[PDB]
Amino acid sequence: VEPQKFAEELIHRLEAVQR
Amino acid sequence: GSMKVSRDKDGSKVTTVVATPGQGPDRPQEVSYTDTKVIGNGSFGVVYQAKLCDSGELVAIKKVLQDKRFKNRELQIMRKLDHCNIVRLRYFFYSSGEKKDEVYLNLVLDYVPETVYRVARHYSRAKQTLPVIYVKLYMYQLFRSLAYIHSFGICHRDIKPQNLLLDPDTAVLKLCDFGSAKQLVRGEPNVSYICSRYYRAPELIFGATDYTSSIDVWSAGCVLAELLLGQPIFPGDSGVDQLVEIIKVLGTPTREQIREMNPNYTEFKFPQIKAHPWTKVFRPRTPPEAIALCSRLLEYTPTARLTPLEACAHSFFDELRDPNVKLPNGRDTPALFNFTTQELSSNPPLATILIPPHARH
Amino acid sequence: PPPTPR
Ligand SMILES: Nc1ncnc2c1ncn2[C@@H]1O[C@H](COP(=O)(O)OP(=O)(O)O)[C@@H](O)[C@H]1O
Ligand SMILES: [Cl-]
Ligand SMILES: [Mg+2]
Ligand SMILES: [Mg+2]
């Protein structure tokens, strides 16, 4: 599990829910 | 392993084995039991209920396969445990099973009929909330067991409602399932993919290998929130799913908080999501002190979370320290103040709060 | 989730 790949997915998800 | 199977006095099948007692030096003795029936089953093995022929007392027999692939410390950990809020290991013995020429480990434990999960599920499908008195009782006893195992440096690593056994009549809670438990040593790495979904600490999801016993406290905070809410607070199939739920409540962690969890993530630019106020997370009838306690357990920074002993002394459990408290069924509360020097070892002055004056007599 | 491999 690369930190880069994990953060990439998280950032994508957070942008979706961000007001 | 030698296992004499016979019948006695009623045609009832009786199983006789030579089992080693859980405590003290290894002095195995003949143990006979009957009325064997499966009460649990999974990929780990099988769990049977049985009745000891001598005392007539009910026991659970956890039969797990000796898997050489992973490390199992379950036996060695349970043998050194002795606490009123941890399920007792009466005996253990080895035998065969389904796999040909294979050896299984049998754990003979005290039988406890219910779990926190099953009790909580009743209230959920009844559209009711678990009375605060039980939330206090169950959480308090959970924290005592944690304070106990942590004093030995042992981390459970799988705290969740399904692992919290209940005797509803006496309202006594017993922590069980030590198949994931481990004695944490600073400087030695640990597996990150541990703890069950919904209850996994954020540092674990971030892939930390240098975590501490405080992950059990996070999980306990999840159990508390769940009991107040009527459902898991951080659901999700994957780690990212669960982390999004956490972030939607706590807000995006700061760089410093990220560093405390896992330094390898400090330089990523995560979107800044605002925290959702705890009073808005739970129903409007939720006790303020339950909300306060929960916010001190569910913290990003592991060192900021309360210790189990500190949690017991929290104002949320003040009611339990009242002389005139009784269970809704009419019985008195279980033993709650019989702390030992070992339990208090992390913080001895807390005894002033933990042991009320009416308990010292 | 399983513990650490041998
Ligand atoms: N001592 C016991 N008495 C009664 N039921 C038990 C006892 N121990 C475990 N159980 C039940 O059997 C289930 C499996 O036990 P557990 O130790 O958690 O197995 P696993 O390691 O596979 O999760 C538990 O969820 C619990 O409900
Ligand atoms: Cl936001
Ligand atoms: Mg379990
Ligand atoms: Mg297990």
Numbering used by the authors:
A (entry chain B): 383 to 401
B (entry chain A): 24 to 384
C (entry chain C): 1569 to 1574
Text of the article:
Glycogen synthase kinase-3 (GSK-3) is a highly conserved kinase that in higher animals functions in insulin signaling, microtubule regulation, inflammatory pathways, and developmental programs including Hedgehog, Notch and Wnt signaling. GSK-3 differs from most kinases in that it is constitutively active and controlled by inhibition, rather than by specific activation conferred by phosphorylation of the activation loop. GSK-3 prefers pre-phosphorylated substrates, termed ‘primed’ substrates, with a phosphorylated serine or threonine residue at the position 4 residues C-terminal (P+4) to the serine or threonine to be phosphorylated (P+0). Here we show that the auto-inhibitory pS9 peptide sequence and the inhibitory LRP6 c- and e-motifs all bind to GSK-3 as pseudo-substrates.
We determined crystal structures of GSK-3β residues 1-383 phosphorylated at the inhibitory pS9 residue by AKT at 2.1 Å resolution, as well as GSK-3β bound to phosphorylated LRP6 c- and e-motif inhibitory peptides at 2.3 Å resolution. The LRP6 complexes were produced by replacing the first 12 residues of GSK-3β with the 8-residue c- or e-motif from LRP6. In the LRP6 inhibitory peptide complexes, residues 1569PPPpTPR of the c-motif or 1604PPPpSPC of the e-motif are visible; the second phosphorylation site in these peptides is disordered and we were not able to ascertain whether it is phosphorylated in the crystallized protein. Residues in the P+1, P+2, and P+3 positions (Arg-Thr-Thr in the pS9 peptide, or Pro-Pro-Pro in the LRP6 c- and e-motif peptides) form an arch over the conserved Ile217, and the P+1 residue packs against Tyr216 (discussed in more detail below). In addition to these interactions, the LRP6 peptide complexes also reveal a water-mediated connection between the backbone carbonyl oxygens of the P+2 proline and Tyr216. Phe67 packs against the threonine at the P+2 residue of the pS9 peptide, and although Ser66 and Phe67 are poorly ordered in the LRP6 c- and e-motif complexes, modeling them in the same position as that observed in the pS9 complex shows that Phe67 can pack against the P+2 proline of the LRP6 peptides. Although the second phosphorylation site in the LRP6 motif, which is three residues C-terminal to the phosphorylated Ser or Thr in the P+4 site, has been shown to be biologically important for LRP6 function, we do not observe it in either the c-motif or e-motif complex structures. The kinetic and structural data presented here demonstrate that the phosphorylated LRP6 repeat motifs act as direct inhibitors of GSK-3 catalytic activity.
